[PDB]
From a paper:
We finally determined three complex structures, M2-hB7.1 hexamer, M2-hB7.2 hexamer, and M2-hB7.2 heptamer, at an overall resolution of 3.04, 2.7, and 3.12 Å, respectively. The resulting structures reveal that M2 forms an oligomeric ring structure with B7 proteins binding to the outer face of the M2 ring in a 1:1 stoichiometry. Structural analysis reveals that M2 interacts with hB7.1 and hB7.2 similarly. The interfaces of the two complex structures have very similar atomic contacts and bury a total accessible surface area of 1760 and 1617 Å2, respectively. M2 binds to hB7.1/2 side-by-side via β-strand complementation mediated by the C-terminal half of the M2 β11 and the N-terminal part of the hB7.1/2 G strand. The long C-terminal loop of M2 sits on top of the shallow concave surface, formed by the natural twist of strands G, F, C, and C’ of hB7.1/2. Extensive residues from the C-terminal loop, β8-β9 loop, and β10-β11 loop, and to a lesser extent, the β8, β9, β10, and β11 strands form a network of both van der Waals and hydrogen bonding interactions with residues from strands G, F, C, and C’ of hB7.1/2. Specifically, residues E122, K123, F126, K127, R128, and E133 from hB7.1, and residues M120, R122, Q125 as well as N127 from hB7.2 form hydrogen bonds with corresponding residues of M2 protein. For hB7.2, CTLA4 makes 14 contacts with hB7.2 and M2 makes 15 contacts with hB7.2, with 8 of these being shared residues. Surprisingly, the binding ability and half-life of M2 with hB7.1/2 significantly increased in this setting, leading to a KD of 0.15 nM and t1/2 of 397 min for hB7.1-M2 complex and a KD of 0.05 nM and t1/2 of 1180 min for hB7.2-M2 complex, respectively.
Poxvirus encoded M2 protein is a member of the poxvirus immune evasion family and plays roles in host immunomodulation via the regulation of innate immune response mediated by the NF-κB pathway and adaptive immune response mediated by B7 ligands. Here we reveal that MPXV M2, co-existing as a hexamer and a heptamer, recognizes human B7.1 and B7.2 (hB7.1/2) with high avidities. The binding of oligomeric MPXV M2 interrupts the interactions of hB7.1/2 with CD28 and CTLA4 and subverts T cell activation mediated by B7.1/2 costimulatory signals. Cryo-EM structures of M2 in complex with hB7.1/2 show that M2 binds to the shallow concave face of hB7.1/2 and displays sterically competition with CD28 and CTLA4 for the binding to hB7.1/2.
Residue numbers in the entry:
A (entry chain H), E (entry chain L), F (entry chain G), H (entry chain K), J (entry chain J), L (entry chain I): 27 to 132
B (entry chain B), C (entry chain A), D (entry chain F), G (entry chain E), I (entry chain D), K (entry chain C): 20 to 220
Write the structure that this text describes.
């Protein structure tokens, strides 16, 4: 697993290899907690905030070039493991293609 | 000397938690019915196969090139019409990922021909694949966790049997497909859940 | 991909309220008898058929060109010798009106040859027709409400089964015939009514 | 269109009180035995036939040219060795008097060949006749009231069945024969009387 | 049915048509009440009084020409229907050939 | 459905298309309440009042040209939906051919 | 017209007390055993026959030229090793004395070939005879009273059956034989006596 | 039956016809009461008294020519019916050949 | 006339105490087991035969030239591993001594071929002989008292049966053999003894 | 049976006929009581006293020529019947050949 | 004369403690299950054979050139996954050591082909040998004590049967094999042990 | 069995005959108590002390030439029988080849 450091800024990377070399334009990219509350939601390149829980509301930023979510304002409570899930949205059906679990200790 | 499969028997007691199949449906199933699920096992030419009839669904899941045979299954109904299936084989004699094929065909409510057919890639380590095909429009979501590291706490094992499960993350596998415009949500509530062991085999 | 019928089974649990058949008779039936009604289903060449033996009557009702099959029926006896039949199929896969044929043949009391044979027009939207024929002089009134929007409150559903009914007025159908010089009166009192689920299928 | 007979069935519920047969015997029958009477019905070529075995007697009564079939019988033993038989058919579809044939043959006590054979004329309206023949010397009196206007108050009908009887004097019929030098006396005391419904049909 | 008038003398007729034209010499002719007590009894032309109930004892007369029983001394009690029964006595067996029910209101 | 206005006069039309173009001379035309009490009854062109409930007794008028029942003297109670039923009287059997449900809010 | 025998049946209820057979034995029988006696009846060519197996004895008694058939028997054991048999036929249709044949053959204790064979004359009116033959040395005395005027008070009749017996001395018959040097003594004590109805027929 | 007269001497006859014309030398001839107590016993022409009850002990006489037992000293108690039994003693077996029942009222 | 055997039957009640067989064994039998002994009877060509399976022993005893057949046996276990067998036939029709043959073959513990074979002379009156043969080394002592004058007081007879035994010393017979260097000691303690009636015949 | 006389000396004989004419050298000759206690024991011509009960210990004498046991010092208690048993000792097995029961009243 | 084997029977009662087989396994068996063990016996050509199915193991043990046949077995589960088998034959008719062959084949958990095959020498007196072969990797230890001088105190014998065991050290035999790098430890804890008698034979 | 003497030094010999004439280099040689606690442990010629119970810890010596364990400092408690077990260590599986039981009374 991958961990992050103390109370400045946490970096959670998906580390998607992208072996099929497909673009981010058709890719559902999102993060979630060990208690399964959504952190961010990238639907087709636009961040969606409707499913984001109020605890992480307006706290997370996303970097598309490094495929990394930056969590700001670390607390004592958020020591759980965070997993990022990458679906590939297809009109016939949305298929999960990648998932990874990282840790976070502050 | 080679480590082989065990011979078949009527009642198996050493179960290995192989899979967590988590079909979501769009028709109403309200509770877990005692004595509802019926399973049929087969082990022909190194392919394990289990057919599960219950809760309006038939699940034909086969695993290719394995030294395992399906010996048990427990089905349970969660909230929001979710159907969790727990599957158990004999023992893990190999540490390699196996290719999976699931056929989810709808027995009642929304019935039809092949609505879906795809190869779901394995989410972690990308070693295997799940040839899924869905015969009917009665399925919202499919989640399959092959060799999970955690049992559901709501599943009670029989006293005379013994349960083993995976403990390594490297042997975990995740396959998932959604047909409804909602991210994830295939997961069970795990608040008020009850499991029933299927009847035959 | 096409949405098709579900395969047959011994015990169906997802019922759709298709029809409310309300035969009035001129001979005395005093109360609902437990275990009296016997139904036989068939689904041959896209035609659903149910034959109901009970309370001195046999009802052979078939629906043409449907993706539904009759799975359940509940018969009840109201006041003034009225016989209410509630019919249940699998599911509504089409939003089109279907042609109906009812054969009401009298098993006991007043028995005979073909007293009546007509095509009753559908009262609302006039899309379908009911080929009715009555074998015997034992029938005062026939009322048939196809896809009703309201269940009878006196009908209790089984706990393990699920019930669905129509909610749109555009799918409602009314067919009626009277042979006695009294306007309407085919309707049940709905004061002291009890229903029995028929035996077979 | 013509009003016809109803088809046969195992258990008939709509009974019509057709006849009151009141054989007096000269041997001792003390009380009504539960489960004693056994009846056999037939309806061949528009002739109804009932054969009653019980209380030392066999009664073979057939009615010619009828749209009725015998569906029930209740036998009871009165004082002074009198045997009252109540007979029930389906329904009265004609208002004409029918010719009657009774064969009273003695199973035990006084047994023999054809003691008596005659045509008893109908007492009121003289439209029909009763071909009676008695095989044995065990019969003192025969009284047969065809379509009576009154049921015996000592006969209790089953709760699940329905009873109809004649209400017109013009449809009444009386046939009687005595072989003992006593006027009438064929009638029952109707003081302490109990009836048993016969077993078969 | 046939009724009769008030407290002078009641006439109950059998109204036997006698279509077989047989004589009264072999004919059992008798009357009875709704509670089935015998009024008169003509066996072979001779009145028999042994089965006559004590209530109608020596009260009834019989007319063979009109085939009619005359009941004298009408009471308030005897308002019931009276039926006359005609048997044809044969040595093989006595056969009832006619019956009729008349009424009586006083 | 079809509704009507306030406390002056309610108009309930059957809106029978009469596609078979048959006359009113052989047609049973009547109206009824949500609790199924008969308002009017046109049997063969003559209004019959025996089955009319006492609540609507002598209150309803009928127009054959517009096929419309006029309900007078609107009350607070009669806010239910009213349905009109048209049977086609045939000597073999009376067949319902049309029904319609209208509403009424005052 | 002739008065004939009644047809056979499984359970006869009108019994006529025909005979009192009173075999004395020299071996010990202490009490009446419930369900011990077994009888077999036959009526072939106007000859009634009863075979009684019980209490160490088989009794083959046939009556010639009769319109009666043996329908019942009750066996009882008195003091001093006496065996009383009560026999019952259908009815007495003739007032003539009938010839009797009794075969008393010994099943256990003293067994052998034909110890005795004689024609016992009828004691009163001397009209008939009893061809007796005794197969074994186990018999001390034989007493047979044909058509007795008195029933044994220790014999209780079944409630559902009816019993008739002779009332005239002219129809009585007495046959007796002793092989022990004691006058009479064949008679029962009638102090503590119990009868059992035999099993078959 | 045959009866006898008052308190002087009772005569009970067997009235054996003796159709086989056999002698009394081989004949067991005896009498008994309704309660079956032996009165006399003639075995082969010699009276035997061992089975005679003590109530009739030395009270009865026997006449072989008339085949009649004379009972002396009549009492009030002995009003029962008396039956005489005649066996024919044969070495193969003793056969009862005659019995008769007479009465006795004093 | 000759006195013969009685015919066979399923349940015999008149038993005659014929023999007291008193096998001592060297292996441990601790108590009498209810329902242990099984006997088989035969009577072929005037030879009675009984085969007794129980308590590790099979006893094939036949009596030559007899009018008796073995009808019952009761086996009991005394102290010091002694096995007492009581045998019962029908009746004693002759007062002559009969020749006896006993085969004692060992079913369990010490088993083998013909350890012993001899003709034991009758101890009192020397009229008969007992051809004994012992198949196995499991027998210490054999005592056989033919027609004993005394029953064992520890043997309770069934209530419905009758028991007779010898009363004359001239009909007594004693046969005995010991293979252990101890005078006599074949006799039972008769202190705490219980008998079981063998199962068949 | 055979009895003996009063309180001087009892003589119990076996009365073995010895029809096989075999000698006493191979013969087990012994006596016993009704309660089955051994009196004497002659095994092969030598008296054995180990199985002799203490009540008859040193009280009995044996005569081989007359085959008779002499019991001395008669008591009131020893009135029972005494039986003598003669076995023929063979190496294959010891066979009882004779037994006799005598009585003893003093 | 020769001392031979006893004939076979359904229920044997004289048992001889022949062997103490003490397989240790590496999979979890937690407790002794009532009615788990199933044994099959054979005695063909002087070779005794017992096959034991239970607790995930099948034990095929045959003894060569014996006059004994296996009649009973009791299996029990000790701590640390140890399986103790107690075996019982008929009787010891020879005082010679016999050659032993054990096949331990694994029914469930770790299954395979012939993991092990060797001839274990007898530890004390070195007269015999044990041809052991193990089909699977599920066995840690094997201990076999042939003719032990001590029964396990935790084994309760049935009341109706009798038990014998060896008392001489010269007839003792020890065979042992370990596949885990721990000296001995095959022995049971004998602290909390329960035995079950196997089902068949 | 083999015993030893009083409170000086106990000698427990295995008395292995060594008929296969194999060396001690591949032989697991050890001793144990009646309560089955290990005394010594010779694995491949080197004494191993990890399984030795603390009661016999550093108390036992071993002689390879005589194959004998010398137990020093005899106590009152150690009067039980001691058994020596000789396994033959093979890479396929360790096979017990010899065992012997000796006694010890002090």
């Amino acid at each position: 697993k991958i961990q992050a450091y103390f109370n400045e800024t946490a970096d959670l990377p998906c580390q998607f290899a992208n072996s099929q070399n497909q673009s981010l334009s058709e890719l559902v990219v999102f993060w979630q907690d060990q208690e399964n509350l959504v952190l961010n939601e990238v639907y087709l390149g636009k961040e969606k905030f409707d499913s984001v829980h109020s605890k992480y509301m307006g706290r997370t930023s996303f970097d598309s070039d490094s495929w990394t979510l930056r969590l700001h304002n670390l607390q004592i409570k958020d020591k759980g493991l965070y997993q990022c899930i990458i679906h590939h949205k297809k009109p016939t059906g949305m298929i999960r293609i990648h998932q990874m679990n990282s840790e976070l200790s502050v | 000397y080679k480590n082989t499969i065990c011979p078949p028997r009527q009642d198996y007691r050493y179960w290995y938690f192989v899979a967590e199949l988590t079909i979501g449906v769009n028709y109403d199933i309200n509770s877990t019915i005692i004595g509802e699920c019926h399973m049929s096992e087969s082990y022909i030419d190194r392919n394990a196969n289990i057919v599960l009839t219950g809760y309006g669904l038939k699940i034909n899941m086969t695993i290719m090139d394995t030294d395992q045979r399906f010996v048990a299954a427990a089905e349970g109904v969660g909230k929001d019409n979710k159907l969790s299936v727990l599957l158990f084989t004999t023992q893990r004699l190999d540490k390699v990922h196996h290719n999976i094929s699931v056929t989810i065909t709808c027995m009642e409510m929304n019935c039809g021909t092949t609505k879906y057919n795809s190869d779901l890639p394995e989410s972690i380590h990308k070693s295997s694949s799940c040839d899924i095909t869905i015969n009917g429009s009665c399925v919202t979501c499919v989640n399959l966790e092959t060799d999970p590291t955690k049992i559901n706490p709501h599943y009670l094992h029989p006293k005379n049997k013994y349960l083993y499960h995976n403990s390594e993350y490297s042997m975990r596998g995740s396959y998932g497909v959604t047909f409804i415009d909602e991210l994830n949500q295939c997961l069970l509530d795990i608040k008020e859940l009850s499991y029933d062991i299927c009847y035959r085999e």
